[PDB]
Amino acid sequence: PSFKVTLINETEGLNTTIEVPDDEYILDAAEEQGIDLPYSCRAGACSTCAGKITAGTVDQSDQSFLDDDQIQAGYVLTCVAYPTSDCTILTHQEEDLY
Numbered sequence: 408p409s410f411k412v413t414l415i416n417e418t419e420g421l422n423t424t425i426e427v428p429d430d431e432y433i434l435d436a437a438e439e440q441g442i443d444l445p446y447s448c449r450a451g452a453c454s455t456c457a458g459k460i461t462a463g464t465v466d467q468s469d470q471s472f473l474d475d476d477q478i479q480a481g482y483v484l485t486c487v488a489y490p491t492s493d494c495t496i497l498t499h500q501e502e503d504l505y
C-alpha cells in the first residue's frame with residue numbers, strides 16, 4: 408500500500424503529489440521521484456529536513472529532535488517519516504522552528 412503525499416515549497420516551485428509506499432520514508436521516496444528536499448543527518452536527530460503537516464498523518468516514531476509541542480503543532484522530520492494516510496507537507500520549515 409502507498410499514500411499520496413503532497414509536498415509543497417513554492418520558492419522551489421514545488422507543489423507535487425507523489426505515491427509513497429507505507430514502508431518508505433518520505434525524504435527517500437521524494438528523492439527517488441526526482442524531488443530535491445533539504446537534509447543533513449538523515450537520522451531524525453536535527454531539524455534540517457523539517458516540514459509541517461497541513462493534512463493527513465505520518466509515523467515519525469524514529470525521530471528524536473522535535474519536542475511534544477512541535478509534534479503537536481504539526482512539525483515532521485521528513486527523513487524519518489512514513490506516511491500513514493494521504494498527507495500534505497510544507498517542506499523547508501526549519502526556520503519556522505526558531
Ligand code: FES
Nearest residue numbers: 447449451453486
Ligand atoms: S536531516 Fe537531520 S533529522 Fe532529518
